Every structure is written in C-alpha cells, then in structure tokens.
C-alpha cells in the first residue's frame, strides 16, 4: 500500500469510512537483529544499527557508540565528538526532510518531495565523500569516527547550509498557510501530554503535545552542551503542530551545523588507545605492537568489561536507546534496541479515535514510522 | 519451590476442563476455516488434524504446562478466526510438501547417517 510504508499490515475495522479500531500488525520486517548482534562482535554489530532506522544512520551509530564507550570507560577525542554532532545534525535534516515530504506525499503534495530529495541527494554526496557509502556509512564507531574529513568537505557543507534556508522557506510557502493542508492536519491525532507520557512517546510527539523535553538539552551527549539552539514546543498536539515543530527543528539543526562548522577543532579522530581503536596503517606496517593490536582488534575485538547500560539519544524520530549487556567477552551478551517508533505505532490506535481513513493516513505520516527500527 | 505459583486451573481437573473447552472451540471452527480459506481438504480432515494436534500433548502431567498449551491454542485459534493467517499457514499444519521420512533402521541406514 502506498501509505503503509510497504511492510505494514494495518487491520482496520471501518464503519463506512469512520475508523472503529486500528490493529497494526508488525514483524513483516523482523530480521532478528538482536540475536545476530549477540552472535557478532562489537565492531561487527555497528552496521546492524546502521540499518535499523535507515533515515537516521549516523544517529543510530552514535547511540550505539555512546553505549559501547560508556561500557568501555573511554572517551572520544573532541574532534571526533564535533564530527559526530555535525553529522548527527546533517542526518536530522535528512530525516526531517524525508518525514515531512512523505507526509505531504501521503496527503497529496509531491513537488516538496522532489525538491527536498534533491537536497537529500546533496547530503548523500556529503555522506559518501566522508565515508564512501551514500547512506549506510558505518562511519561513527566506538571511540570516535573511522576517518578524517577530506580537505573540501567543510567548505561544501558551508555552501549547502548557506543555500538551504531558501529551500525550507519554499517548502513553507506551499503548506504552512495552505487552507487544504491546515484542514488535513489541524486537530488530527490529538494526544494529550499525560497520555503521551503514559504511552511512552518521545521527541516530536511530546514536544507537539507541549512537553518541554529534549534530550540534547536535558541530558547532553558529545558536545551538545557547547552549541546553542531552540526547542520548538507545540500547543495543540496535532499533525499541524508536529509538522511546524519538525520544520523549526530543521532550522535549529541548521543553526547547530553552522556552529559546528565554525567550532571544528583540530586533533585526532579516534581515542588514542590501540587496545580499543585500530592504529594507523603506517603504524601497523612499521610497529610490532601496532601490528599485534590491529590483528587482535580485527580478529577477536576488544573486550568490554561486564555490565549493563541503557544509553539514549535524541534521534530525529525521538528517543532512540540501546540497553547493552556485556559479560566481559568481545561479543555483546544482550542488545535490546528501543526505537521511538515502536511506542508511537503502539499508540496509533488511540490517536485514530473518531477519525477516518485519510485521517489515519495523516496520523501515520505525522508519527513518522520506520519499520526497520520498529521491528528490528 | 514446593509451592509453585499456579497460572490458573489449580489442579489437573480444571486444566482438563479448559482443554475440553478449547477442543470444543476448535471443533466448531473447522467448517468456518474450510469455508473462508477455501481449503481443498475435507471438514473431517480438519477435525482429524485438530484431534491429532491435541493428542500429541496428551502425555503432559503438569497443570501449568497444560495451561500454557491451552493459552497458545487459544492464540492459534484467534489467529485463524480473524483470518490473520492465510491458506499458507493452515496448510503448513499438514506438511503437504515433505517426502515421507523413513522410520525403519534399514531405510535410515540406506539413506544416510541420521540416527
């Protein structure tokens, strides 16, 4: 189904066209990611997170890397942290573009999809230049980042950031004050703050309902405590307010990108601990200890001290968390993945009370569900 | 522990009562399953398969295990009634595409190393 994101079976009970109950059937994209992670090492499990929410790739990677670093009791270098924040905001722009444009496409607007996807192509070019893969970079790793930026990436990112506010303004010229868009989105899928908190919504859902909560402000990670940005807050808790919140979050991510570009520091890109992060190629090919550590890291991997952690980040779709349990070996014993879309899709039924089929389409769009992360 | 927490049904009598209730629920459903899914099997075949699936767990002597089995049976039934399943799964109950696995020692010896 075009509006079902391809892999969602939504068994609906309709009286005419009014919705009586929604029964989302998920698992059509269940792969057994957690079991496979239990069978892989820590370095071999990063692409699994890369493929969980395939619209916020470096965000998933950053969450996993934060969990592993917290368990390892190490610290990424400041340049690595700044790169992580910059690319996290770039990925937030990517995800918000995808969400808003697919929402408008499910409602009946496609030209913003095409424009913002040209912008997405440019950001994919940034991804590919920094990593070699257009979307599934596998770039952010426990201890920092894999490789340093090329010598034109910052200038190109500055050019793109400079020429993107006009794109957002053109998007807003088509939907924000349009009466048809307001009719479709206003007072649709209204969720109260208490209901959102009880159902476990996170991120844009809470902020649209009016809850002043943002993990980047309350529980900062990396260098998010050194950047300045505003947190959009909704008033009516509907699709229109959530769309406005997402657009303003795009603008604030542009702010953060500008700040990161100006404040990019020098230094190394991964923790200077060859027992955790691999050494350079020259050191490997000239130093005996470096060769031994490269061999061991790429065959057995680093051992993580026993313990369990739950680390969460403000991924573009809400609070994305990982509960990682290590038994002292080089492979994770348990890896539970908390995707924000799981609770939202669980709460889809309540938000679609007294609505119709088109309203349910709009509510799914405003929930912004990715079933890779929903099912895992 | 000596005082194991019961799921329900307490002793084995109430567990048997729940087993019989679930058996009645399944038995009255086979004609509807055949009609809706447009199965090519007979109603007698469906009832026989329900009977066989019930009988393969006849050796259970633990009330908690019986309660879990009837819970999962009710889950399977509610999957069938709501047409959540397809003809694919209902026929998966029948193993219609498997070759008849040999069971005698001589045939097992001939085919391979399987005990």
């Amino acid at each position: 189904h075009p509006a079902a994101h391809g892999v969602l079976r939504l068994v609906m009970e309709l009286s005419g066209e009014m919705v009586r109950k929604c029964d989302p059937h998920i698992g059509l994209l269940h792969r057994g990611t957690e079991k496979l992670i239990e069978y892989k090492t820590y370095l071999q499990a990063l692409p699994y997170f890369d493929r969980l929410d395939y619209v916020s790739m470096m965000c998933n990677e950053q969450a996993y890397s934060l969990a592993v670093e917290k368990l390892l009791n190490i610290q990424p270098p400041p340049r690595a942290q700044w790169i992580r924040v910059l690319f996290g905001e770039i990925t937030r722009l990517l995800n918000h573009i995808m969400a808003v444009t697919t929402h408008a496409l499910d409602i009946g607007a496609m030209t913003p999809f095409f424009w913002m996807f040209e912008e997405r192509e440019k950001m994919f070019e940034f991804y590919e230049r920094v990593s070699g893969a257009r979307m599934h970079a596998a770039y952010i790793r426990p201890g920092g980042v894999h490789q340093d930026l090329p010598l034109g990436l910052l200038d190109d990112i500055y050019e793109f950031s400079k020429n993107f506010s006009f794109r957002i303004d053109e998007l807003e010229e088509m939907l924000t004050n349009n009466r048809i868009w307001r009719n479709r989105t206003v007072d649709i899928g209204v969720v109260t703050a208490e209901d959102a908190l009880n159902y476990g919504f996170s991120g844009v859902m809470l902020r649209g309902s009016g809850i002043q909560w943002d993990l980047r402000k309350t529980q900062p990670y990396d260098v998010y405590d050194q950047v300045e940005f505003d947190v959009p807050i909704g008033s009516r808790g509907d699709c229109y307010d959530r769309y406005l919140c997402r657009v303003e979050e795009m603008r604030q991510s542009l702010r953060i990108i500008s700040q990161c570009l100006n404040k990019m520091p020098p230094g190394e890109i991964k923790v200077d601990d060859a027992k955790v992060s691999p050494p350079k190629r020259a050191e490997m090919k000239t130093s005996m200890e470096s060769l031994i550590h490269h061999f061991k890291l790429y065959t057995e991997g680093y051992q993580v001290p026993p313990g369990a952690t739950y680390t969460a980040i403000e991924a573009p779709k809400g609070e994305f968390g990982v509960y990682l349990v290590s038994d002292g070996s080089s492979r994770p014993y348990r890896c539970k993945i908390k995707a924000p879309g799981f609770a939202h899709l669980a709460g889809l039924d309540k938000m679609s009370k007294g609505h119709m089929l088109a309203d349910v389409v709009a509510i799914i769009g405003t929930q912004d569900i990715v079933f890779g992360e929903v099912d895992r | 522990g000596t005082s194991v927490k019961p799921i329900f049904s307490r002793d084995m009598n109430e567990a048997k009562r729940r087993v019989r209730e679930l058996y009645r629920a399944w038995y009255r459903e086979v004609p509807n399953t055949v009609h809706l899914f447009q199965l090519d099997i007979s109603v007698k075949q469906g009832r026989d398969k329900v009977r066989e699936m019930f009988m393969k767990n006849a050796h259970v002597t633990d009330p908690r295990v019986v309660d879990l089995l009837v819970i999962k049976g009710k889950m399977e039934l509610e999957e069938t009634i709501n047409v959540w399943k397809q003809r694919t799964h209902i026929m998966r109950f029948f193993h219609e595409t498997e070759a008849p696995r040999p069971t005698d020692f001589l045939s097992k010896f001939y085919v391979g190393h399987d005990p």
Binding site: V191, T192, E194, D195, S209, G210, I233, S235 | -
Partner: protein, 112 residues
Amino acid sequence: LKKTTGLVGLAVCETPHERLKILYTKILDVLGQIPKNAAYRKYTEQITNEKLGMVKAEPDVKKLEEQLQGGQIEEVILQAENELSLARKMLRWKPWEPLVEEPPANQWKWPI
C-alpha cells in the same frame, strides 16, 4: 488568570490554593492509617507538610510555583492527586512488611 497551561489536556484551575490545601489534607488523612514506623509514612508526611506550608504562606501563584519547583500549579495539583491515589494503594498493599522471599543463591550474579 492565565489563558492556557501550555500542555494539551491540562485545564487551568481558577482556585489553585484551595484545591492544593484540600488535596494535601486528604493525603495527610490517608497517611494516618499507615503504621507510624513505616518509612513511607514519614517521608510522605514530611514532604506533604513542607509543601502544604508553602501554599498557606504565599498568596501569589507565580511565587508559589517558584517555591514549589514542581512545574505549574496545575501540574502540582495533578501530582497531589497522583500522590493521594498512591497513598491509598500503598495503604492496601502494606509494603513496610519484611521481605517476601529471598532470591535463590545466585540470581543477580554477573558475569555468569
């Protein structure tokens, strides 16, 4: 006075002080049934009397909100209602009793 609380589903209350006094008095009344040595009774009585003292000494709603540090006065009222319901449930549950049962010999060991 204020138009909205900024939270969907949270209506503005025109009588914050009276409602807060009533709720805190009800909570204190419920806590009287709990045995004296129970640690839930002491802490909850302390915090309730501490917060009930503030509402009787500050007529201004904004300064009262700043003193309570519990969000807006509507959020404080909602939390008082939740505390009252929790006190009733805790009266039913009686969790001040000793431990129900010790776990097996190695239940929380890790790594294992």
